[PDB]
Every structure is written in C-alpha cells, then in structure tokens.
Design a protein around this ligand. Sequence first.
Ligand SMILES: O=C(Cc1cccc(OC(F)(F)F)c1)Nc1ccc(CCCCc2nnc(NC(=O)Cc3ccccn3)s2)nn1
Ligand SMILES: O=C(Cc1cccc(OC(F)(F)F)c1)Nc1ccc(CCCCc2nnc(NC(=O)Cc3ccccn3)s2)nn1
Lengths: 410, 404, 402, 404
Amino acid sequence: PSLEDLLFYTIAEGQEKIPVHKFITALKSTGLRTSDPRLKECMDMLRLTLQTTSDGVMLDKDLFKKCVQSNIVLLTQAFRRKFVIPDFMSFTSHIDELYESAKKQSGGKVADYIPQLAKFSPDLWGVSVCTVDGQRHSTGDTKVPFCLQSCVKPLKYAIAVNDLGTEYVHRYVGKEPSGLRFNKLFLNEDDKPHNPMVNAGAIVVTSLIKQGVNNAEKFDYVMQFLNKMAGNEYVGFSNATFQSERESGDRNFAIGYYLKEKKCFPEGTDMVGILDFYFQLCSIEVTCESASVMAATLANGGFCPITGERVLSPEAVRNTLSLMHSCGMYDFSGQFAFHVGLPAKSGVAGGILLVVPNVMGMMCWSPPLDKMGNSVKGIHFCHDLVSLCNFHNYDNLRHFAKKLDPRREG
Amino acid sequence: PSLEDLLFYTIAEGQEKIPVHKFITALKSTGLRTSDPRLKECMDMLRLTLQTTSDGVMLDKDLFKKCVQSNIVLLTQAFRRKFVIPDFMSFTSHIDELYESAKKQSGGKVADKFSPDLWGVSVCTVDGQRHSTGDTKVPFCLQSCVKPLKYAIAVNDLGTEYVHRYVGKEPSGLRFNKLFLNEDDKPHNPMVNAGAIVVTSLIKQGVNNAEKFDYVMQFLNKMAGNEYVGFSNATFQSERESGDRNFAIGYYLKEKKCFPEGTDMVGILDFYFQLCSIEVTCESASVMAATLANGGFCPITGERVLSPEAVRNTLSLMHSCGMYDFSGQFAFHVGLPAKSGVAGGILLVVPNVMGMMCWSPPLDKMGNSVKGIHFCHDLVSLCNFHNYDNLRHFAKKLDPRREG
Amino acid sequence: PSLEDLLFYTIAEGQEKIPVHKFITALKSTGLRTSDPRLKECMDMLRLTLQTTSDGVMLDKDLFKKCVQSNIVLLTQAFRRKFVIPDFMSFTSHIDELYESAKKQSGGKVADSPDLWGVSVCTVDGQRHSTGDTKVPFCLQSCVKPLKYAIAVNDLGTEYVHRYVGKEPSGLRFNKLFLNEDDKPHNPMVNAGAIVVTSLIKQGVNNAEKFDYVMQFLNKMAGNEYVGFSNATFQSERESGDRNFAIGYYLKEKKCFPEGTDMVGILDFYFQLCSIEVTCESASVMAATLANGGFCPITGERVLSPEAVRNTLSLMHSCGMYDFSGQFAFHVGLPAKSGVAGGILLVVPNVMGMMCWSPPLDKMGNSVKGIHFCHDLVSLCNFHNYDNLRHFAKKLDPRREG
Amino acid sequence: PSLEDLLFYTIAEGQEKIPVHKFITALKSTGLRTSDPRLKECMDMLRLTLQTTSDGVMLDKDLFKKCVQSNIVLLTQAFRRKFVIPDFMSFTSHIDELYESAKKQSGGKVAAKFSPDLWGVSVCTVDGQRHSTGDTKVPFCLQSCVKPLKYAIAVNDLGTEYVHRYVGKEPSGLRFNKLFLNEDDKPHNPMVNAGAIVVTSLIKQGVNNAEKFDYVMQFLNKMAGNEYVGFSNATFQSERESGDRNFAIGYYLKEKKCFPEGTDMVGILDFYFQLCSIEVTCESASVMAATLANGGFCPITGERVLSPEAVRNTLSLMHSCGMYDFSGQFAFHVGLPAKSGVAGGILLVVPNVMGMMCWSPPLDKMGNSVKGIHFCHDLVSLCNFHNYDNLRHFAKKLDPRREG
Ligand SMILES: O=C(Cc1cccc(OC(F)(F)F)c1)Nc1ccc(CCCCc2nnc(NC(=O)Cc3ccccn3)s2)nn1
Ligand SMILES: O=C(Cc1cccc(OC(F)(F)F)c1)Nc1ccc(CCCCc2nnc(NC(=O)Cc3ccccn3)s2)nn1
C-alpha cells in the first residue's frame, strides 16, 4: 500500500500529478519551514529535480516518491494533521493579534546602566514560536540580535544538572524562591544561594560547569551546548556588552567575595575567573527565532524539535522548568505563576524566554522594562496568551470554559 | 447503527447470552464501581431483572440492551478502554506496591489521639475509576486540607479579583512562616491560617453562621459526589479551647481591618473551627480531589461544582503553598498540587488524571504525614505525573495514560 | 556654737530680728516650696507663732531657733547653697526660655488640647519649678511602663523579671514583632513587654488589690502629690484594644506569662494602668525619685531599690521613645519615656526629674514640643549622659556658680 | 604665705629637710608617675640638683621650691588629695583583686602552645593617676578597638552632620547583625565593619594613604600622651589576605554609592587593614581611653586632642554598639562605654573618672575577651560606675571618688 503512495494521493486532490509549488505551499501551511534540518534530503532532491527536468515542472508518482521517501515519516505526521497544533495557520493569526495588542502598550524604561543597551530602540518588539514538532512562526523584530542576560540562567543550570545530576548541583544552590523580603540577601539560612535564577545562585551554578578546564574551553563547551539547543540557529557573543558588564559589576563582585568567604564554591574555584565567565555567559546573543527554538527544546523534554537531537536529560529539563515557574520573573514571579502559570525567564535586555510544556517554546523581546525588570510588552503578551488559550499550568485539558485550545478541533 | 448491540458481543464471547456476574466482573475491571451515580438506571434495571427469577439470570441481546441503553455512552467508553487510565488493573497493582513500601515508614508523631498505624490511600480518576488500599473508610477531620476547598468556594462565588483584595497569592518564604500579614497588610495566601481565616469571612456574607455551615456542607457534598461528609464536634470543641494563636491572628486581622465590613471576627473564628472539624474518608476526599483534577466537574456524577477559574487558582496555591515549610521542596520534587492537614491527610491532585487522598496520622516535624509524603515521592518517581514531566520523553518513568 | 544660731546670723545679716516674710522669701528662692513635707514642723510652728502673737511680726533668735530646729539640716543645705543646682533662680529662667521656645512649634496631631503645654521640674533635693499648663491632669499611658517595671524589679529582683522580658531594643525593623528570638518580648518598654510585666506584679490577689497596690506605690514616688484615674480613658482603651488582645493571645499561646495567669484579666489591669492620671508637677516628682536612686526627694522616703531604678533608667535610655529611641539616645542622652497623651517623663540622673506635656504628637508618637524641649535642654546644659563634667565647651553647667 | 613652702612642710613633717627619695615615694602614692609629661620641668630640676653632688642628698625649703615651682599647681592638687580618686592606693588594691579574679577564667579561644596566655589591665584616671597589673607592656593590635578612635577623629575634623550623612547612629538589632546597610542605604553605625570602612573613607580626603596613615598615627600619639603606638606588618598582611568579607562589603558600598565622591574603594580597604593593625599596649591604650573619659583632653599632657562633640558621639555609640551581639547585655549590666577587639582587647571608658585597657587574647563565642568581660562585670558590681548608678544612694557598692 505504501506511505509515500498514500501521502501521494492526499496532496494530489484529483489530478495525476502535483505542482512542486503546490506541494511546497501545502508544506508551509503545516508550519514547517522548507529549511527544516529534518527535511534536507527531500528539499535537495526537489531542487535537483528542478534542474534535471526543467520541462514540468511536475512530479509523477515515483518522482515524488523519490524526493520525500527519506523524510516520509515527518512529512506524513505533518500532512495528516498529527502535529501538536494541527490548525497552525489559525493559531498564528491569533499570535499576530496578541502581538498587535501588546504593540500598543508603549510604557517602560530601557535598561541604561551600560551603553550597549541604551542604544537599543524602545520600539523593537518581536515574538517567535517553535512548537515541539518544529512548527515555526514569527512576527515583529525577530531577527535582531540581543543578549540573553539572565535568560541564560536556566540554560546553564540545565547544563550543570545534565552533566552532574540534581543532587550534586543542589548541594550548592537551593531550590525555592526567596520570598519578597529576602530580595536583597545573598544566601538562605543554609548558607546556599536561594535558587539558580538569582544572580548569586547563577554565579555558583556557573562555578560547577566543566570544572578544571580553563575559561576559554568552558565558554566553547557552553556555546556548543546552546547551538544544539537552538538547532544550530544563531547563537552569538557581544564583546561590547561583556566589557561593560565587567566594569560596572560591583554587586556581582560583592556577591562573589561573600560566596568565597562563606565557602559556597567547589574546592579549587578561582572566584574572579568565575565572575569573568559569568559575565561572558550573560553576553551570549540570540534572536527571537533562535531563542524560541531553545525554549522548545525545554518544552520538548530535552529533544531539539527541529533536529530530533537529544540535548538535555529529562531530569535537567524538569528541574529547570520548575524553577522558572517559581523564580524566573524576579519579584513578579509569584504573580506570574498565579496569573500565567508558565515557566518563564526574563532578562534585562527585554527577552522573556517562555515554555508551554508539551506544546511550544517562545521568545518575546521588547527592550523597555517595568519597575521589576520585566519587558512590558512581553508581560502583557503573556497574560493575553493565557487569557486566550488553555495553556495555564493548571488549566484543565477537558473543561476550560471559553478558552481556546489550539491542540484540537475543526 | 447498533450502539448497544456492539457492546453485547464485545462482552459475550460470540455467544448466546451473558451471565450477569460476568458483566459485573467485566465492569469492575474498568475501575468503575457498580454504585457509580451515573450507572444508577442500569443498576436499577438489573435489580428489576434479577427479581423476575432466581436463576442465572442471563441476558439476551434484547434484555442486555434494556438494562444498558440509559447509560450506554459511559459504558462503551469504559469497555473500549477510553478512560484516562485504560489499564487500570495494572495501575492499581502499582498503587498497591507504593502503598506497601510507604507502610514500612514507621516514623513521625501523632498530633495532640488516633492510632499511629492507620494508613490509607484512595484514587478517583477524572473518569470515575476508583481504587483503595488500607484504612480508607475511617472518618477523620480535614483540618487544613479544607483550606483549598473553601478558597475554591469563595472564588467560585465572588471571583478572583474580589477574593484577592483580602488575601495574597504567593508563599511567604521560609522566614515569614511566622508573620500574619505581608507588606500590603494582607495574609500571604489562603493556605496559611491567617489567610484561611480571612477567606472564611468572605463566604456567604450577611447570612448567619448556621446557614453558612449548611452551604459549605452542601458544597462539599457536590464535591464528593455525595459520598461521606460529616462533622466532629469533639474536634471542634478541642480546636476552640486551644485556638490561642488563631485568636491572636483574629484580633490582629481585625485591628488591621483585614475583614470585609460588617464582619463579626469572634464568630468567623468559630465558623473557621467548624470547617476544620469537617470529617471525610480517604474515599470521599479522593472524589473531592478528582473534582479539582477534572476542571470543577465531579467525575462520578457529571455535575459542574466549581468554576474553572476557582479550580485553577486553587491548584496554583496548592502547588506553592500547600505543604507548609515543605512547599518548596515538594513542588520541586513532586510537582503536584497538594494540601496536608494535621490529622494526617494529604489531599493530592494530578491534573487531568486523578485525585487522591492519603491518610496516616503520624506527622513529620513540618506537620506532614510521613507515609503520605513518602508515597507522594514514590508516585512521581514511578509515573510521569510531575507537573514538568514531559508527556512524550520521560526516560524510564511509567505512563499510566498509555497502553501496552 | 549651734547650727540654728549660725544659720540665724546668715539670714539676719543686719538687724537683731528677721521678719518672717523675709525668711520665707529667702526660703522659696532656694527653690523649696513652703508646702514641702520635710518643712511641715517648721511651717506649723511659724503659723502657730503668727497666731501666738499677732504683732511684729518680730522673730528674734531664740524664736527662730524653736521654729526651725526640727528641720535644721535641710534648711542649712538650702541656705548654704548646698543643693544640686545652687543658683536655682537663674536655672528656672533658662527653663522658661526653653519652654517659650518649644511653645512656638505648633505641629503634630493629638491622639484622637493642641494648645496645652507644660513643664515641671523637681530636683534630687526637692527644688520645684513649673511653667505653663502644669496642674492639668492627664493619663500616664505608656509613661507608666518604666514605673511598673521598676515596681516589679523592686518586689521581684532582676533575675525573675527577666526570665519573662528581654533587656534590649532590637531593630527599627523588628519593631513590629511581639517576641524576640528567645520567645520573650523584647524589653519592658514595648506593649508586649509591658503586658508581661503587668502580669508579674502582686500575683495571687484580685485586680482591685493589684491596682490599689500600684497606686499606693505611685503615691510614694510622687511624694503624695496627685495620682488619679480616668475611667473614661479606661473604657476607651478597653474597647479599642484589638492590637493588645492580639498580643495577649500570642503571649498565652507561647507561654510567656507566669503560671496561673488570667490573660484577659491581665489585659484589663494593663488598660487600668495606662489610664492612671498625673499632672506635670506630680509626675516630675516621680521622675525625680528615679533621678535620686529611688528616694522620693520631697519626702526622703525610700521608694524603690537601686537595682530597680538602675534597670529602669537603662531601658528608658535605649527603648524609651518608640522608633526615635536610637536618635534620642544619641542626640539627647537622657533616660526618657513618652506616652500618647503627650507626656514625656524625663530623668537627668543625679540632678532632677521632669515631666513635659503637650498632646500633639509627631509621626513617631512623641510630643512634638516635648521633643523640641529635650533637644534644647541638652544643647544648652551639659546634661547629656556622655557630656563631660569638666570640659564641656560653650554649654552651661547649672551645678555651679562661678 | 606661698604655695611651694606650704607644700614643703606637709611633705617634710616638722623637720629640716626633705630627702629626695621621700618626695618621690610621696609623689608615686598619689598615682602620678615620675615620668608624667606635666612633671618634666620638676624632674629636670631634680636631675640637675642630683648632679651637683654625690650622695648629698636632700632639699631645703629653698631647694625644694626651686624644683617644684613650675609644676606647683599640679603637685598641690596631688598632695592635697584633690584627684578624682583621692585614695588611689586603696583603689589599685581593688583593681588587683579584680584582676586576679578574672585571671582564673580560663575559657575562650584565640582568634599547639608554648607559653601561658597573657592578661593585662591598665588604669589611667582623668587626672593622670596610673596603675597596671599583668602583661601591660606587651604590644598587640587594636583591631576593632580602633573603630571608636577613628570615628572620633573624623567627627573631630568634619563634624557630626557630615560624618552621619555616610554612617548611621544606632545599633541594628541582633537579627540584622548580618546586613551591611540599614533602610537608608547607609551602614548602621561606625562600630560595625561596614560602618568603620566608610568612616575610614572620610579621614583626610585628598592626600594619599601613606599621609593619611601618618596623620592617624600622629592623632593616636596625642591621645596616648605620646606613649606606645606602633604597627604590625604581620597582622596587616594576614588581615588583607583574609579579607574576603571586607571586600564583599567594599563592593556593596561602592555599588550602593556609600562613599564620598572620588573614593578609591580598593585603596580604602588597604587603609582600613592598616588601621586594624596598629599596635598599642595596655598602658598606652588606657591613656587613649582616659582622653575619651576626660572630654577630649589628654590627662597626662593637658593637650586638647578631640572636640567634645567627637568624644560625646563616640562614647554614645560605644555604649550601644561596642561589644558586638553582647552590646545590649553589656549596656544593661555594665553600663559603661567600651569597645572590644579580636586580638583580646577591651577599650573601657568610665566618663569623668578614668580610661582602661584590658587585654587577654582568648575570646568568647561572640568575639569578646573572656577575662576582660569578667573583669568589667566585677568592676561595676564593686563600684558605682554604672552609667545609671546613683552617686548619692548606691547600696553597698564602693565609690572611690569619696574619702573614707
Ligand atoms: O537593604 C537593606 C534595608 C533593609 C534593612 C532591614 C530590613 C529590610 O527589610 C526588607 F528586607 F524586607 F527589605 C530592609 N538591607 C540590606 C540588604 C542587603 C545587604 C547585603 C546583604 C549581604 C549579607 C547577607 N547576605 N545573605 C544573608 N543571608 C542570611 O543571613 C540568611 C539567614 C536568614 C535568617 C536567619 C539566618 N540566616 S546575609 N545589606 N543590607
Ligand atoms: O518568631 C519570632 C522571633 C524568631 C525568629 C527566628 C527564630 C525564632 O526561634 C523560635 F521562634 F523558634 F524560638 C524566633 N518573633 C515573632 C514572630 C511572630 C510574631 C507575631 C507577629 C504578628 C505581627 C506581624 N505580622 N505580620 C507582619 N508583617 C508586616 O508587618 C510587614 C513586615 C515587616 C517585616 C516582616 C514581614 N512583614 S508584622 N511575633 N514575634
């Protein structure tokens, strides 16, 4: 009977043959991009076919079988509406509306404590989606690079848990939110930083990754790791931001010395070098599009949805999503978990890394911040997104009132 | 067509007629109980047919159809493995192993009268599948397990915005477990005593306390599918003679004007002690938890009991605030919304899957049942129920929602 | 040569007899009052002889001798300039200028009257001075806290009292907690500490006897000047005491009281003690007893033990003025206690006691005018705890003449 | 009539001449030392007269007058028992009893062993009377005993209102004894490390730290009447290799902009380490304390060293913040301003009476010299020196200001 065969009659509504562009247009409406790394054999074979047969340009039955047979499983799920969001085109129109609504919210202040971020216009606003099946959508300024800043904190925590395990990592860092009075304290009662998402905790996490090698290799180790999480889309580095972050980081130096004195680091830690490494990790650059793929790896249990590659252990991803839930949005963490109920991490450059587990990852970026440090338009977008769709952690998948569920339905 | 006939042969081995016991046995392995309120017409119609004779009795396609047609949608789901846990018989063996492993955990102190060897676990899935092991029909008081239930009621009747004018929505953090109010002069959240006291003051304002208790009781009846709910006047007397800290809380809340206008603080405290003395079993409480797991619909009656807004809010504050000073550790390791109480109950919700009640009176130093806490950890070590487990890639955890 | 004889010649100076009014005028200029209880025998015999010969009114040497022989020691200290403040008339001029200076600070808010303002002085030797509204009765309120702590330490000792209450301030940021880390109230000057102290006094008698016992105690500290009671204030404090009932229950729960304590009854007694009434004049004598190592300066009676007075002055220093205690100790350096009626009980150790009263309070709860007066007094005189008695710059020292 | 001859007859009784040694013995029993800087002219004049012959050796009314004329006012005061403690020989006997009693308190840890542990106590009254017992000439580092001294310097040179733009005036409370800043983003007071780090940054701004150090040394020489002051490079290196907490404090002060404009934070810390390593003995530190006891006038030289505002502010903050977490208990029971240091010293001021230094390296769990704290308790148990003792009615305490 044959899968390439059946798939074949699906797209050939009636005629004996399929226009190439008709196949492509139907393929894009799944949400996949033609550049998807799991589709390269079929796409090369299609480009090749346009060369060796300029006459159609069209695909007989064993011809189309020749192109798609190597990527047939993925192509079948895509076309039999088996993806996690089957009517992706309708969903993206909602995302676009949410985008436009948030664009009207013009408040907030751009971070200005170093000139590498006071240059960023307050009117850039970008949102990117990548589902657990690699379906993609973007609107606004989603290819402009910006620094992860604290959005890097769960990514490096995930790396440490992946290489070292939960039990070892949390000998060094706690696993719960401070409470809003303990905002300003470096250590909890057990002389550990409260959790990996506060600066002091991220500084200790930074100190456990790849112990014993030097900083250059430590950085390459982590960059290699972010590449895989992003399915090899753009991961960069801002020396300009790193230089300025290192010359105005008095409070992180205050933290570093206190942790050294309280013996918070592993035996043999060069605290000043760990601080240097920490500033580097804050200066790693992404776009909305590449960061959204990183979020989707977290949404997808540690597998990069656009490569199929296993990147992080389930243990690492579960721990990470737990702490983003409860500690990821600074003093707004409790409010955010209550009203949004999604694991999220914000950073001072205006990014909000966001995870809808089992569904999708997003990156929202708009430089202006509210008093707590969260992007105004990202915060507004996140509330709206959950008002509209039953993605809240404690929404019910069967009884959800007037909320829309994009995992379903005609 | 043939909706009820297709059921007849699925159960009858291509054969003339079904013995009744064989249909009942087939129905128990779905996990449903013959007493399920949604199966009443069918069971009534069997009792009439059993009265015709004293024989098999056995049912022909025509007689079978006459019993089951009223409840056919539910019964087919059950028998074509459509329920949220299709292989429920395998699942309960695991629950049984979990139960016996926690039974060996002998530590803890009983608060102070009950026996330290009582230990029960009850499950009710979002589809009404039931299982119990241990001391699951012994009544005991909810105590603080009631706090999510009455917060649910208050949000259900007044909305989230009104309720959180009077109570916060975050954990305090390990040091202010002793403070009564947060910086905005509100109790930190409704899972602490100060906050449950304020929440108690919002329910059915204006009406008197006797009717207020009636309303809550009726509301809990809906929540339990009308299974066992009661009241311990002995606990109520004990709780009130020793409620010094609760009175300290009440007067401080009064002075800081934390109550709605027209509140009688001393009466609210009395009402609060009443709500803490409400009695349940493991079985009836597990149905209440399943209502919360099922979006506000009681899984064994089909009735809508709470708004989805109420359930969501309640499940959120149970995640972060429901296990006292262990809330943060429990969230991190178990990832399940839960509420413990000093009688030794742990009300436990696995959203979209099942509700549970665990009960063993011996508490650890934080006030949580030792065996319930052990059981909860093991449950999520075993099955991919942690709130941030992935539903597609979960390593070697078992997933009871799948077959094979 | 007899002592009443030489004291006679110093006052007689010229002629052979002293008009009585000349003696009395010279006596008041020491700052003593004619009504002083240590002067009663001399004053009674002076009144007697103004009857016993309605002439003159003469007063020769032997007549002087039989009038003043009973009180000759104190009269000699007074006339030989032996009192702690010898030039008392010059000092009272200074008090008056400070009074008038504080009088023009009209800010603050009463406790829910803005023109009542009085200041009374009583030295360790019984010299009195008043200016302004100093015979108007008003409730001690929290000014009673050091007085009943002193009573409890006097009857019970320091060890016993302080199993139940702490000894230090603890934090402008733990100023909202009821208990310190050892589950005791922080010190006797906060409400929860003052509530526990109340529960220690005269245990095992009913509340009416406890009250009479403390009022009798306050009578002695005040040299039997006005001590009274305000049922109006008592009923008010008792209806609006939700905060203190919240403290009482937390204290019960954490077992802060002595065994056998009726907490609700203790709160009633506590409300009673807050409602006790004084004037500036009588309260100043109370302060002066504290300044005089526990002896009432206008009666010579021993009222409190050195231990009780030392402990009380120490805690007034650091916990006396609500959240202004740290700043007051630094800038004023005098033991003091304020209350919500506008009083400020003030002790200059070894010199004098004072009571200042002006109802309007600043946002920390202290009488605006009292606070301004207390700063000005220390700016002018070398009375700060850590002023030096020998090298003190431009400050004045009223313990001296030339 | 002549003051010098009036003194002659008193020393001599009714004899011809005063043997020199009998005048020396008579002078030493006032408490004054023959090396007292204010008695130098008189001692130079006995030195001259003692070189004019072999073993002569006595002074006539005319010779005596020749020696004592330049210092007659101060010798008169001494010999007519006008000093603040008139019967000084009796008082030092009491200091010796107190010393021996504290000597038996062997507990504590220093901040392997070869020699006994050291214990010394020096007294210097406001009139310059001196007494010493134990290891009083062994140099040791001030460490945090220097904190009141450098705060006084800064208030002396800059005033109260400038200094307290940068540092607070109150103790933090036992439960904020771990924070660097109070709610106004300033260190709590000058006696905590964070506060002393800022006080250090105020002294002699606009010269380099070698000149700043010189200035403080010159100032400390004035305070000690030019007795021993020095510097331990050993302590200075060890204090700076192990100053991670002080660097954490320094960076937090910088981030929060707590220093005066133009401050080099890393250099101030190095200056701060130097000041902690300055060396005194018991004897010379007691003179420093005595200067604080005497309104800012050095008692053995008569020089005005600090303004009264500096000294008053310094004594006030020693009262409440001087003995770490024991400050509250020490203020209540001892009632004297004091400052302890981790080398074992306790700078002790009895206002208007005397200054003392007690030194014994073993510290209690709070960081205070065990023996020094024992002595301080005994001293006020014995004498009516407590800030709130009464000078007239004082139970059966002793008052060494009085005759007999
Ligand atoms: O900013 C301020 C105003 C202020 C004042 C007081 C209260 C306050 O209230 C508020 F906290 F709610 F804001 C604010 N202060 C401030 C803020 C920050 C700092 C740098 C902090 C560095 C020193 C420390 N870091 N972590 C620590 N952890 C513990 O001690 C853990 C613990 C907890 C309980 C029991 C035992 N151990 S210590 N130093 N000082
Ligand atoms: O609990 C303690 C010592 C303590 C420590 C650590 C360990 C410890 O050990 C031990 F308890 F086990 F002994 C004891 N003290 C205590 C504890 C509780 C109480 C009743 C308190 C009722 C009064 C208040 N309720 N909420 C408030 N919040 C606000 O006002 C705003 C603010 C400012 C600061 C902090 C948070 N909020 S005030 N009053 N005092």
